Amino acid sequence: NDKKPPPYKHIKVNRPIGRVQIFTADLSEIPRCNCKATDENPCGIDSECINRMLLYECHPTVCPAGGRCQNQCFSKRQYPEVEIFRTLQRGWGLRTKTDIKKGEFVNEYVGELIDEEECRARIRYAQEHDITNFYMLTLDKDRIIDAGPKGNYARFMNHCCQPNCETQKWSVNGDTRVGLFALSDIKAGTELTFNYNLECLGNGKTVCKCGAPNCSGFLGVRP
Ligand SMILES: C[S@@+](CC[C@H](N)C(=O)[O-])C[C@H]1O[C@@H](n2cnc3c(N)ncnc32)[C@H](O)[C@@H]1O
Ligand SMILES: Nc1nc2c(O)cc(SSc3cc(O)c4nc(N)sc4c3)cc2s1
Ligand SMILES: *Sc1cc(O)c2nc(N)sc2c1
Ligand SMILES: [Ca+2]
Ligand SMILES: [Ca+2]
Ligand SMILES: [Zn+2]
Ligand SMILES: [Zn+2]
Ligand SMILES: [Zn+2]
């Protein structure tokens, strides 16, 4: 629902579970860009910042722009203002309260970081309790983000076959994170969606109610 959760279920960074590892970089393995602190928008979405080209967040100890660096989106957790709302046939969803420009950072897909054994146990539990909402995305061959038991606002974004947001996997201080980014200009009040079918995991598949002209008919089917 759209009520404030118990605080322990709202997490701000990914939460490793059980045997799952997270990784850290030596600062010498982190790319350093050529932007200047005096630039109009140092390391911004229109810049030529090499870190952005590599989908690597600038490290705050390293980047020449320092505190003017605009390529620290994941670490700073400054997200466009959003709100949870009830849809007609797709449960709860997420909509922006502010205009968002094409390519802008919308949110990080934050959740519990689990391995495949744990993910199987959670899907089997969902099967036994008739749970029909899933919040799992593949991070890599060993790790899955599950924003179901804990997460942030991104867990409420619904699926669309012709969405207005996309996932991008970035490197942040030596480990991978999933960011959501606008595919186009989005007006305030618009529901935020992405295409689940590239990376999602769940209990089988379910009929898609996105209603897009190109609708492929299902959530849960690799294209
Ligand atoms: C990541 S959650 C999104 C938030 C969810 N609607 C809720 O109320 O908590 C994904 C779940 O939302 C539902 N959903 C999202 N997009 C849908 C769509 N296009 N068609 C049908 N169900 C959808 C499915 O039940 C899916 O398991
Ligand atoms: N009035 C309101 N305040 C808040 C707020 O402060 C934070 C969020 S964000 S995160 C969240 C929300 C859930 O409902 C949830 N449920 C799980 N099982 S995990 C999880 C994570 C939503 C609302 S709505
Ligand atoms: S991969 C996947 C993603 C979902 O959101 C989902 N929801 C269901 N009811 S099955 C399934 C699979
Ligand atoms: Ca360029
Ligand atoms: Ca594997
Ligand atoms: Zn830069
Ligand atoms: Zn920078
Ligand atoms: Zn669809």
UniProtKB/Swiss-Prot annotation:
Subcellular compartments: Nucleus; Chromosome
UniProt effect for mutating residue 122 to Q: In SOTOS; loss of enzyme activity
SET domain ranges (all copies): 80-197
Residues that hold S-adenosyl-L-methionine according to the record: 90-92, 132-135, 158-159, 203, 209
All copies of domain AWS, residue ranges: 28-78
Effect of residue 155 to Q: In SOTOS; loss of enzyme activity
SS bonds (residue pairs): none
Region ranges (Inhibits enzyme activity in the absence of bound histone): 198-204
Expression sites (tissue/organ): Expressed in the fetal/adult brain, kidney, skeletal muscle, spleen, and the thymus, and faintly in the lung.
Domain Post-SET: 204-220
Function noted in UniProt: Transcriptional intermediary factor capable of both negatively or positively influencing transcription, depending on the cellular context.
Disease: Sotos syndrome: An autosomal dominant, childhood overgrowth syndrome characterized by pre- and postnatal overgrowth, developmental delay, intellectual disability, advanced bone age, and abnormal craniofacial morphology including macrodolichocephaly with frontal bossing, frontoparietal sparseness of hair, apparent hypertelorism, downslanting palpebral fissures, and facial flushing. Common oral findings include: premature eruption of teeth; high, arched palate; pointed chin and, more rarely, prognathism. Beckwith-Wiedemann syndrome: A disorder characterized by anterior abdominal wall defects including exomphalos (omphalocele), pre- and postnatal overgrowth, and macroglossia. Additional less frequent complications include specific developmental defects and a predisposition to embryonal tumors.
Subunit structure, as described in the record: Interacts with the ligand-binding domains of RARA and THRA in the absence of ligand; in the presence of ligand the interaction is severely disrupted but some binding still occurs. Interacts with the ligand-binding domains of RXRA and ESRRA only in the presence of ligand. Interacts with ZNF496. Interacts with AR DNA- and ligand-binding domains.
Family affiliation: Belongs to the class V-like SAM-binding methyltransferase superfamily.
Listed name of the protein: Histone-lysine N-methyltransferase, H3 lysine-36 specific
Species of provenance: Homo sapiens
Gene of this entry: NSD1
Shown part of the complete sequence: 1863 to 2085 of 2696
